[PDB]
Write an enzyme that holds these catalytic residues in place. Structure first.
Site, short mmCIF file in Angstrom:
data_model
loop_
_atom_site.label_atom_id
_atom_site.label_comp_id
_atom_site.label_asym_id
_atom_site.label_seq_id
_atom_site.Cartn_x
_atom_site.Cartn_y
_atom_site.Cartn_z
N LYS A 44 -3.10 2.06 3.52
CA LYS A 44 -2.97 3.37 4.17
C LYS A 44 -2.83 3.19 5.68
CE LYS A 44 -7.81 4.77 4.54
NZ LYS A 44 -8.70 5.92 4.17
N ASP A 139 -16.81 15.22 0.11
CA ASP A 139 -15.49 15.71 -0.28
C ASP A 139 -15.12 15.14 -1.65
OD1 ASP A 139 -13.28 17.34 0.02
OD2 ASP A 139 -12.08 15.91 1.18
C1 WMN Z 1 -7.69 7.37 -1.90
C2 WMN Z 1 -7.38 8.85 -1.96
C3 WMN Z 1 -6.24 9.17 -2.89
O1 WMN Z 1 -5.91 8.40 -3.77
C4 WMN Z 1 -5.46 10.47 -2.73
O2 WMN Z 1 -5.78 11.14 -1.54
C5 WMN Z 1 -3.96 10.17 -2.77
O3 WMN Z 1 -3.22 11.40 -2.88
C6 WMN Z 1 -3.51 9.46 -1.50
C7 WMN Z 1 -2.16 8.75 -1.60
C8 WMN Z 1 -2.12 7.70 -2.68
C9 WMN Z 1 -3.08 6.83 -2.94
C10 WMN Z 1 -3.00 5.74 -3.94
C11 WMN Z 1 -1.93 5.78 -4.85
C12 WMN Z 1 -1.78 4.79 -5.81
O4 WMN Z 1 -0.73 4.86 -6.69
C13 WMN Z 1 -2.66 3.73 -5.88
C14 WMN Z 1 -3.71 3.65 -4.99
O5 WMN Z 1 -4.55 2.59 -5.09
C15 WMN Z 1 -3.92 4.64 -4.00
C16 WMN Z 1 -5.08 4.42 -3.11
O6 WMN Z 1 -5.72 3.40 -3.12
O7 WMN Z 1 -5.38 5.43 -2.28
C17 WMN Z 1 -6.40 5.20 -1.26
C18 WMN Z 1 -5.78 4.40 -0.12
C19 WMN Z 1 -6.89 6.59 -0.86
#
Ligand code: WMN
Length: 346
Positions: A44, A139
């Site tokens: 991120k 949250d």
């Molecule tokens: C964790 C928070 C979320 O997952 C959520 O806010 C999401 O909408 C944010 C964007 C995507 C996160 C995501 C997506 C996939 O396919 C795999 C992941 O491991 C993650 C992830 O780890 O999100 C963390 C960074 C925020």
């Protein structure tokens, strides 16, 4: 630097073969191949430094997650940023790549009772660790609950967290804004700053209800509508519960309402396990002092297949007071973020 959707996503050379996977609060989220550990990861991008409040949220999460280690909390694997404060404009946090999150899953997938039980156990197991560190997540919601391909569950985002402070939790009517609307406890709207652990238990109860039916149980259309949905299902609070609210504006608002009957959980959820509904009722209790706590929830009969206190660890080093991040200008917070992330530099 490598670019994603016209934006800088500068993570190389360790992390390559980038793919866009969604949006974070201060930037985009990509997956990427970790060339050292030979696995794909989530990254991120955070761009907080122009605003004091953004810096607060970023520092908060970094401080908490660098102390926490738990199977049901998604940790920080690596932090990427420029070598000097002068050059540091963005910060990238590298975390395990999961398969989905509970928000996405509930859009299309019905959960078996065994999945609901296992997910809820893992949520409460992670929450026990969080609360044992004297921290409030503040949250909890389906999109902050990540799942891998074997349905291991991990809690995401500690940017809104706080150190618990029950002795200073009381406030006035219709002023507080903690959590995301649908997952926000009734007392937030009435007399609470969201500084006690019961705020998180309410959110877990809302998540359990949503797992049972794939719809949010309290879908308020705006801030003021949320209490309408809560009272429309729980019914009017008892005299004892109203006497626990000393604030006159809050108590008199509730006293001004016509009587509403409680809607039975088994009428809302006729296919649900009755043990699940008993636990649901204890989590969605109106009076936060009567609301079940995390260690009681783990010991509830619904979770008996999983409950094992010796395998439900607590934090070694609880946070004794809040970080007192306020009044700190954004320049001092950037300095603190730079120092807290130094352990990851070559
Ligand atoms: C964790 C928070 C979320 O997952 C959520 O806010 C999401 O909408 C944010 C964007 C995507 C996160 C995501 C997506 C996939 O396919 C795999 C992941 O491991 C993650 C992830 O780890 O999100 C963390 C960074 C925020």
């Amino acid at each position: 630097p490598e670019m994603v959707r016209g934006q800088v996503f500068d993570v190389g050379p360790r992390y390559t073969n980038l793919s866009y996977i969604g949006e974070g609060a201060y930037g985009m989220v990509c997956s990427a191949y970790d060339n050292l550990n030979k696995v794909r990861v989530a990254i991120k991008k955070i761009s907080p430094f122009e605003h004091q409040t953004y810096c607060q949220r970023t520092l908060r999460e970094i401080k908490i997650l660098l102390r926490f280690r738990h199977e049901n909390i998604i940790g920080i694997n690596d932090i990427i940023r420029a070598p000097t404060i002068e050059q540091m404009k963005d910060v990238y946090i590298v975390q395990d790549l999961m398969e989905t999150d509970l928000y996405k899953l509930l859009k299309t997938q019905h959960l078996s009772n065994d999945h609901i039980c296992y997910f809820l156990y893992q949520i409460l197991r992670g929450l026990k660790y969080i609360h044992s560190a004297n921290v409030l997540h503040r949250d909890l919601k389906p999109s902050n609950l990540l799942l891998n391909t074997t349905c291991d569950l991990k809690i995401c985002d500690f940017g809104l967290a706080r150190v618990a402070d029950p002795d200073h939790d009381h406030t006035g009517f219709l002023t507080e804004y903690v959590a995301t609307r649908w997952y926000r406890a009734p007392e937030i709207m009435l007399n609470s700053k969201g500084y006690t652990k019961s705020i998180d238990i309410w959110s877990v109860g809302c998540i359990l209800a949503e797992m049972l039916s794939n719809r949010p149980i309290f879908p308020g259309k705006h801030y003021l509508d949320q209490l309408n949905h809560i009272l429309g299902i729980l019914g009017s609070p008892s005299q004892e519960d109203l006497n626990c609210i000393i604030n006159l504006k809050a108590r008199n608002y509730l006293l001004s309402l016509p009587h509403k009957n409680k809607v039975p959980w088994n009428r809302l959820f006729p296919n649900a396990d009755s043990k699940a509904l008993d636990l649901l009722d204890k989590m969605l209790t109106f009076n936060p002092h009567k609301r079940i706590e995390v260690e009681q929830a783990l010991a509830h009969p619904y979770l008996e297949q999983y409950y094992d206190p010796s395998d439900e660890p607590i934090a070694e080093a609880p946070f004794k007071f809040d970080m007192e991040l306020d009044d700190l200008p954004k320049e001092k917070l950037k300095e603190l973020i730079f120092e807290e992330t130094a352990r990851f530099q070559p």
